[PDB]
């Protein structure tokens, strides 16, 4: 039925010791293209946390080219990815700057018929932001 124009909430949180990721996929071999993206990030005595449900018919975020992007993110241990049903937002704390750049651009890439908004925002001047 023309499917539905929405895709399936989606959220990451990559600190570094331990990595939280819940959500739904489509498919179980989705999983190999963005762990294949992990393996940049797998540490020894790192733990991982990601439950991820199967459901070849519920619209979920395209990571087929998450590797190149995620790539991008992977310099920082300390990003957050979250998708949502119109739009995906993008937030990471950058003791930099540019260093963004690269990391929105791959993602624009990867999702550009949907609105992508990276706000970065540096914990320096102001005071700790949400836990």
Same mark, same amino acid.
């Given at each position: 039925?023309?499917?539905?124009? #929405? !895709?399936?909430?989606? @959220?990451?949180?990559?600190?570094?010791?331990?990595?939280?990721? $819940?959500? =739904? &996929?489509?498919?179980?071999?989705?999983?190999?293209?963005?762990?294949?993206?992990?393996?940049?990030?797998?540490?020894?005595?790192?733990?991982?946390?990601?439950?991820?449900?199967?459901?070849?018919?519920?619209? #979920? !975020?395209?990571?087929? @080219?998450?590797?190149?992007?995620?790539?991008?993110?992977?310099? $920082?241990? =300390? &990003?957050?990815?979250?998708?949502?049903?119109?739009?995906?937002?993008?937030?990471?704390?950058?003791?930099?700057?540019?260093?963004?750049?690269?990391?929105?651009?791959?993602?624009?890439?990867?999702?550009?018929?949907?609105?992508?908004?990276?706000?970065?925002?540096?914990?320096?001047?102001?005071?700790?932001?949400?836990?």
């Amino acid at each position: 039925g023309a499917s539905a124009l #929405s !895709l399936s909430l989606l @959220s990451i949180s990559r600190s570094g010791n331990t990595v939280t990721l $819940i959500g =739904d &996929f489509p498919d179980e071999a989705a999983k190999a293209a963005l762990m294949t993206a992990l393996n940049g990030l797998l540490a020894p005595g790192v733990n991982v946390i990601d439950q991820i449900h199967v459901d070849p018919v519920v619209r #979920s !975020l395209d990571f087929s @080219s998450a590797e190149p992007v995620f790539t991008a993110s992977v310099p $920082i241990p =300390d &990003f957050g990815l979250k998708v949502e049903r119109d739009t995906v937002t993008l937030t990471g704390t950058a003791p930099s700057s540019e260093h963004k750049d690269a990391v929105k651009r791959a993602a624009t890439s990867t999702w550009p018929d949907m609105k992508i908004v990276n706000n970065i925002e540096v914990t320096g001047q102001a005071p700790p932001g949400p836990p």
